[PDB]
Ligand binder design. Structure first.
Ligand SMILES: CN(C)c1ccc2c(-c3cc(C(=O)NCCOCCOCCCCNS(=O)(=O)C(F)(F)F)ccc3C(=O)O)c3ccc(=[N+](C)C)cc-3oc2c1
Length: 293
């Protein structure tokens, strides 16, 4: 079955006075492959995809500041915090040229970074990424009312911060197949203390839906406009029915994004990695071998 363990030796690096944990496996030489997770996960969401790439390429999977095994300072955990921390992390590791493998809010970080440093990105494999959703009618019907309540400071915080609803409910509801008690416990681990759950609430409140918030909408429209023109090699993973990328959206992205290969992973919601890790990791390795890296 799908692996439930996290057998990776811990690595840490001082970043802006804060310690950040990351996975680092694979051959020391060659172009590194940087794995970026999102809400509400960690490098744990990559545990079954990294082993397909580690035999031949260096694999770096950090835990975003405030999540996973990284330090958890008292911050708002706005997207701009994660941008400052991820920019410094990359420079603290001395990474020159990289290939990106990104998902959810890690895709926002990855796309925003690649647009500012397109000389250092040899390829992007992305899935269930962040794009400007123009209307709430584009969000799945089964999750509208809840995510609307999430984007308030009274009901949203009570649900997500006090009652841990994003871990206990929203995370299972983003995977088609059922998560095991071991897997739930891994995702629960960085957030047993309710105060440490700020990022779980700030991320859905940063989601560019229906024109708000205007600044995130503007930033994401910028890297979407770069994506539509840049020749950078592109690998899109999508599934049915999806959440952020519905199948109809993926088909247009496959026809409009230059240098783009799309791959139907089957049934899927948001955490595609948990529904078909074997196809995603095996397809990333195959695609990697076609890059000038
Ligand atoms: C185990 N088991 C299947 C469930 C299922 C549901 C629940 C629910 C539950 C959850 C929801 C709920 O989460 N709805 C919304 C689902 O969301 C699907 C969309 O995917 C988002 C993927 C993430 C995308 N990333 S991101 O955020 O950066 C973004 F989007 F990009 F910005 C709604 C109602 C209920 C309910 O019981 O009325 C619980 C509610 C309360 C609770 N108590 C107070 C402890 C425990 C709950 O326990 C549950 C357990």
């Amino acid at each position: 079955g799908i692996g439930t363990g996290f057998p990776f030796d811990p690595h840490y690096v001082e970043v802006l006075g804060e310690r950040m944990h990351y996975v680092d496996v694979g051959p020391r030489d060659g172009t590194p492959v940087l794995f970026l997770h999102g809400n509400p996960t960690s490098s744990y969401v990559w545990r079954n995809i990294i082993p397909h790439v580690a035999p031949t390429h260096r694999c770096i999977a950090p835990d975003l500041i405030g999540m996973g095994k990284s330090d958890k300072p008292d911050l708002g955990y706005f997207f701009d915090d994660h941008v400052r921390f991820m920019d410094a992390f990359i420079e603290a590791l001395g990474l020159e040229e990289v290939v990106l493998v990104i998902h959810d809010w890690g895709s926002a970080l990855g796309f925003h970074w690649a647009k500012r440093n397109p000389e250092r990105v040899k390829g992007i494999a992305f899935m269930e990424f962040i794009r400007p959703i123009p209307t709430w009618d584009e969000w799945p019907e089964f999750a509208r009312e809840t995510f609307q309540a999430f984007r308030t400071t009274d009901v949203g915080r009570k649900l997500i911060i006090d009652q841990n609803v994003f871990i206990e409910g929203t995370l299972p509801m983003g995977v088609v197949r059922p998560l095991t008690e071991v897997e739930m416990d891994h995702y629960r681990e960085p957030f047993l203390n309710p105060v440490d759950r700020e990022p779980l609430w700030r991320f859905p409140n940063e989601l560019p839906i229906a024109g708000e918030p205007a600044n995130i909408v503007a930033l994401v429209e910028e890297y979407m406009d770069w994506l539509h023109q840049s020749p950078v090699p592109k690998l899109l993973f999508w599934g049915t029915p999806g959440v952020l990328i519905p199948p109809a959206e993926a088909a247009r992205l496959a026809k409009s994004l230059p240098n783009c290969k799309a791959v139907d992973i089957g049934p899927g919601l948001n955490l595609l990695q948990e529904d078909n890790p074997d196809l995603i990791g095996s397809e990333i390795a195959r695609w990697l071998s076609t890059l000038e890296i």
